[PDB]
Design a protein around this ligand. Structure first.
Ligand SMILES: CC(C)CN(C[C@@H](O)[C@H](Cc1cc(F)cc(F)c1)NC(=O)O[C@@H]1C[C@@H]2CO[C@@H]3OCC[C@H]1[C@H]23)S(=O)(=O)c1ccc2nc(NC3CC3)sc2c1
Ligand SMILES: [Cl-]
Ligand SMILES: [Cl-]
Ligand SMILES: [Cl-]
Ligand code: NA
Lengths: 99, 99
């Protein structure tokens, strides 16, 4: 598909058996999801943008389905205001910016 | 161009006759640039990021070139940790996400 940018590029994702809405975010290195349980091990991490830093849990090798497309990668879980699909997963679904 | 996402989508912008580096950011509604001088009056705005809010200065109808593409629109100036080109200007340069 081709997604215009007149409004926020929100898509449905499936993660951890749950459906969520998330933002396709080319300005995000990493994928950051609101609080949820995920299986396996994790380790703490600090990530920082506008307004400062938040503490998250880093889970590796997590399968996600993004707008119908499966990928695997690291997911960060914590108190983000918005669920964000970052470049680590956008690359895996073949997403590009075109102009 | 067609920009892949294996690295940050950084481009050169020109604003006020000066070149700067900025991030093409589909997760940003608005364009936010580090402290600089812009002409005219400004209005107040708050923008919510992952770590909290910053106050910024809103300047309207600013001439800005993004990767060689001319735009004229709203620029927010404040203590952002990187220069961000958001959807208000990505739409002016005809950018889409594709996969
Ligand atoms: C968090 C998103 C929902 C929103 N952000 C855009 C992001 O793309 C942002 C853009 C960004 C902001 C920043 F401060 C530094 C940076 F490197 C990139 N990424 C970011 O915060 O990522 C974090 C900082 C690292 C970079 O990527 C890594 O993985 C993602 C999690 C973190 C780390 S933002 O920068 O806070 C932003 C930009 C414009 C904007 N415009 C707004 N307008 C108001 C009407 C609503 S709110 C608003 C918020
Ligand atoms: Cl990853
Ligand atoms: Cl590729
Ligand atoms: Cl604008
Ligand atoms: Na894991």
């Amino acid at each position: 598909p081709q997604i215009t940018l007149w409004k926020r590029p929100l898509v449905t994702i499936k993660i951890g058996g749950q459906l969520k809405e998330a933002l396709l975010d080319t300005g995000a290195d990493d994928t950051v999801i609101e609080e949820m349980s995920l299986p396996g091990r994790w380790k703490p991490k600090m990530i920082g943008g506008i307004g400062g830093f938040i503490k998250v849990r880093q889970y590796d090798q997590i399968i996600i389905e993004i707008a119908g497309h499966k990928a695997i990668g690291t997911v960060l879980v914590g108190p983000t205001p918005v669920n964000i699909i970052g470049r680590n997963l956008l690359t895996q679904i073949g997403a590009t910016l075109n102009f």
